[PDB]
Symmetry: D3
């Protein structure tokens, strides 16, 4: 029994037909080089991801949504211990500067997309419960709030290739498992199936950056803060940004409504935690301003 199993989901390479188009539309609409694990997991269910994504799309594609993710991102620093810079440690492992930069770019890309995924998951979860995810505000978006951000990945960004956990070394599986468990999560975030090609670094990240704050009041309060930012932000959308499960009862069985309810709630927590975690990983390299900047859609 391997250390880490593969969690059930429609992996990037498994999406077919319309769901594959949805995955690509998520990548391009959100300008992110991976489809979040929440999506991938929930995409195993009929209808919901496509439907919810269709509602979210026009709302998440705007500058207003982008500003909300930026607010999330800016607010994602944990007032925790100060971390040492992993750079010298990676240099001591003989990583080149180019390799460290590849890691830093991967962190940046994750730190760009995760806050947008907190917007996404918030919109999906809140709308699932008929809570406010747009359309209720008296004033529609004005000025350039309503404008669309660019479509597609930013230049020079390619899609991530998430490592195959079953194929991964025990070391990779172990650190992904440790990171998972340190935060009482259910699986390694996509971020770690990205970063987990460098389990040497992830072990440093876990010891220096993540384990010291996992499950702490300060981390949880940061998550609370950013979840609140996301939740408030989506109320400014011009139209609802997900689908209500009570509207889905012809498309989904009771059992699927229950599972997706759980999943939506768990992922709303998970994305906020992962948003913080990877920002904190970049913060160790750089500092909070860099790690929370919007480096892609400005």
């Amino acid at each position: 029994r391997s250390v880490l199993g593969s969690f059930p989901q429609v992996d990037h390479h498994q999406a077919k037909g319309q769901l594959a188009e949805v995955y690509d539309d998520i990548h391009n609409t959100m300008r992110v080089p991976w489809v979040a694990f929440g999506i991938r997991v929930m995409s195993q269910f009929p209808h919901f991801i496509p439907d919810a994504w269709a509602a979210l799309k026009p709302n998440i594609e705007t500058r207003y949504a982008e500003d909300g993710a930026d607010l999330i991102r800016l607010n994602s620093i944990v007032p925790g211990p100060v971390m040492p810079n992993p750079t010298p440690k990676l240099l001591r492992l003989g990583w080149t500067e180019s390799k460290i930069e590849e890691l830093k770019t991967a962190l940046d890309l994750l730190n760009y997309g995760n806050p947008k995924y907190l917007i996404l998951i918030t919109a999906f979860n809140e709308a699932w419960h008929e809570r406010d995810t747009g359309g209720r505000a008296p004033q529609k978006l004005r000025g350039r709030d309503a404008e669309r951000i660019p479509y597609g990945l930013p230049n020079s960004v390619e899609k991530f290739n998430l490592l195959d956990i079953e194929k991964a070394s025990d070391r990779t599986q172990t650190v992904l498992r440790d990171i998972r468990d340190a935060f009482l999560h259910h699986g390694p975030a996509s971020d770690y199936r990205v970063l987990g090609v460098w389990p040497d670094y992830l072990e440093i990240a876990l010891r220096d950056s993540l384990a010291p704050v996992a499950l702490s009041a300060e981390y949880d309060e940061t998550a609370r803060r950013i979840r609140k930012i996301a939740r408030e932000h989506v109320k400014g959308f011009d139209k609802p940004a997900g689908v209500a499960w009570r509207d889905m009862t012809e498309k989904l069985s009771a059992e699927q409504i229950a599972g997706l309810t759980g999943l939506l709630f768990m992922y709303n927590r998970f994305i906020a935690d992962i948003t913080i975690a990877i920002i904190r990983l970049k913060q160790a390299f750089s500092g909070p301003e860099d790690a929370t900047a919007n480096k892609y859609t400005n």
Copy 2:
């Protein structure tokens, strides 16, 4: 379309056969007059609730487990604003003392059971992820810790009858909906399908006790605290207290594994929040010592 939907679940009256026996075994083993909403929802899926319960039962029937629930309960007070006693407000609504005592008894019974359900859900959720829910400790429980508590509901305690949301008044549905949404929950806890026969009280409870603290750092920090207590405590069990989803892959589909993962996580949060909420409601009548006492299994 009504204010509040019925969330999918196996309601107490719907359980049949071996699941009805599990439900009764839960009532009797935990000494609680209701089967928690998370169990009722999760019991729509095959295998899991029966199998997890079978693992949990010998753990949760011990005095050790009971002390863990006591520790949760004792630590469930939110360091929030001081609440006014609802008693005079109920007396102004013309409630008799008897009727007020009926409500206080209901709160006491929920306050007894909820922390045990936090142990339950923590055990289920952590075990599902192969995290520590027993059997790893240096030695077995002994002494007082190992003794089973009594089986069955306490003297004078009968099962609660949860109200049927579909049949409830708009006022009842509204306050259950408001209480659900005040905490960003997915449905009304069983507690409120109990207390919701008194929506005039629940409106006061929401106003006075719950709304002022819902989503607040103080509340969420209390939930973190008691979740941590429960999570630490189950490590003391003599044997694992749930099932791991990687052991359930012949019983559950990928989709059900994902749904149950979500559910377990959501309910591990939900039960903590509700434990705190109904303790807070009793605290308003009484104070923290009474609201957090173990009144039933000493």
Copy 3:
């Protein structure tokens, strides 16, 4: 020169004609044995106190207002250091039990009235700025929230006689001055012109109960908390509960508008600080439950 001046105000014995009736209606509507210092100072301006009181009266005379004052009272404990009971020191000074009880009664009366005066001053100040002090809520008060509390002082309560500061001893003056200055106030609260006939007690109270928390984050946070409570609570009034200065410009000169504006604001802070202070004094004798109880209008 004495260390303490008499601050300009219409003292209880100086009010005449309609203003005297207003003072008495304040005593009797609020069931308090003193007209608060803010009112007595603001009463030297034409119009405002009578006009603002007229607006407030029907709102402050209700159970709803009384519950708001209770919510303030209940939340007025500072999370500060634990205080010793002054009783032994007073006994050792030869105070009789009777006199200690006279002092405790005086504290209880002040602690009854002060939260209601915080509602009063908050309504006045908020309304002065056209902020919400009633009438905007969609739902009017329902049930018995709208009922009047009894008119007049509670049985066995007589009006306080505030000491004449000019005639007071140096020791009374000094401790009132010291208490004023410890909190950066402008004058001794009425409370201290009542309690300051016992300056030996006030010196103990200053040392034990007030000085250690004056100006602290804990005190000021308590004050913020009860100010907020009052400010929120007055929005529930059925009609606005003061007058707007922009509606007073035929009755008040610019200079008077400016002075009253400052006075309103200063007294909105003063009354919250004093509410906390005298509650804290009683808390040293008893404890927070007793010191924050509504002992008069239930």
Copy 4:
């Protein structure tokens, strides 16, 4: 009726004779391009502002006093949520960099002066109550502390022109009223009669920077902090830095003493709050170190 009234005051253009001299002396002694709103309101009273200012001037013109204002400035950052940079948003509204820099300069000027006005108001308020604002210390100021700062506005700085609220657009009135009420203030600070020529920016500032922290414990603790710094600081002046109201009773009536007492207290809070607000506004553009720097009198 207008959304916003003009509050009674001697506006810049209304001061005549000796009071105009005083205004100019305040501009030049403090090196600020506006006479604070507290001064302009209080200047409608005879004697007090000239008399208080005469006492304060030799104290506030010192480098010691400047250091105090620097300490206030450096300590005015609220440990609140992180704010997005308004720069992109102003660029989206088509503002040139030049115009943005004009706004940043105006914020800088406000941020320079407001801490000094907190020294001023603290001196005035504490001296009014005969509390320590100088002359009680062991040593007189000596060395660098004693040197007068430059007189006059800094190079390239011209006096601000405060917008006429009666002539302002509804948009400007609305945002000034919103900012006023967000902090439970009595009128728009001078700062907003300066910045309110850009109501598009002030709407951003209110949503991004001010509203999220208004009335919060963090803001109010910041204010407590800087009020304290100022209050401690002025004890180091060589002689009292204001006038006591007990010494003013031939110059001011009882009513005016009461009005000024309120106004002083209200402005001592107002000016701290506005100090923090406009520093926070600059912080959103440029960070806490830039926002809290002394850029003018070094």
Copy 5:
């Protein structure tokens, strides 16, 4: 090698001659049934303990000192997690009510003495460094404050018999060692050489009451708070309450002065930590009011 060593000290039974008189004088002046471990350790050095006690005695025997120890005691509760009552566990282990009361009496005795020992050690340590421990205050103590408390142990109290650690069971050594190391202390407090005859209880106390808070911010802040209370309090003594090491250089060697400096500082911390610990143990039995009461010298 045993689990626990006996730390060097002049144990109660080893003190001879004038040092035995000093020990008895400490018992009788402080009204405590043990000479604290700090004194016993420091009493191995010549002169210091007799001299410093001579200075302290007239100061600590006063009601003013007693009131200081009461403020410490009252402020020694840690705002930690809520503890279960150990009573049921002890009952289930077959302790009798009488044996439980014997333990509760022991805790009460300890909780009476330890605050006074924090006065003692504070006075010693601060006086060692020529810091203020009396004689600098404006007034001599007058009145109640100056009165000596009674001399001798309270009615019904006899001296404790501290267990001989070398003769103790491994179980007692172990729990003493664990309690010592949980708080990074150097040895078991006298309290645990009292309570360690019930190592069953101390194991419960360690798991339930002490480990959860040891080395925590809350515990350390409690200790800071009470250390501060003692340190402020001894400044009100009429004359210095220890000896300065610079006045002991004919009595002590450099090495002894260094050693005693370290011991005094260590015990200043130790006694505050133990004060809190044993109060917290009694709190688990009863509650903070009982655990912090002065039950012996009123």
Copy 6:
């Protein structure tokens, strides 16, 4: 009598023979230009310093140890008030830029070495109590953690010359005494026998930097944090990094064991406090990134 005494210790110039070798080995192993005051004082006892240093040396000379001290250093900022930069005061006093840089360099040297001395004293103290200082971690250091940092003082660094306190001016004695007593220390840290040649600066530092945070919760929590960092970090050492007193009983007398136990505990606190203090002094010149950088051994 002078203001400040010289505390008993083997000063740098006093160490002879093997102890002088140990002092030089400390300098060179830790790359610090002074032997800490704790070492100097404890070196007056036989055996302990040489023995404990022998155990610590191979552990403290590693990159792992250095990363520990870096973690300490980076976490040493107190979340206290923002400080003004002393530079303008020093320039105004006629300090030259060169001199200010000599000061800044001294601070940087101290800030490099103090965190390492906290590792040192922590190892010594915890080992003295048989607590974990190495050799118990399942995994030995790997990679370059085990590698030696360079031996010797960093290029361009010479030993500090600590001032002779007996020969110092009253001004230097006074500021050293004030700084010692502000923190309730026993003597001036080596840092102030270095910096105290500039008492003008230390007076500014005490006023601007140290006094406002001494004894505060924020300071002491920072110290608790860094002490915990150090204490956890030494457990990662490959073998124990000091000597247990129970292994020293042939080499030290009971009185020396007691004194050293006290001194070790006291210095484990002292070094933490001094670490934070000098970092805070450099932070006033620069900011937290600079003041907590490792400028010497990277």
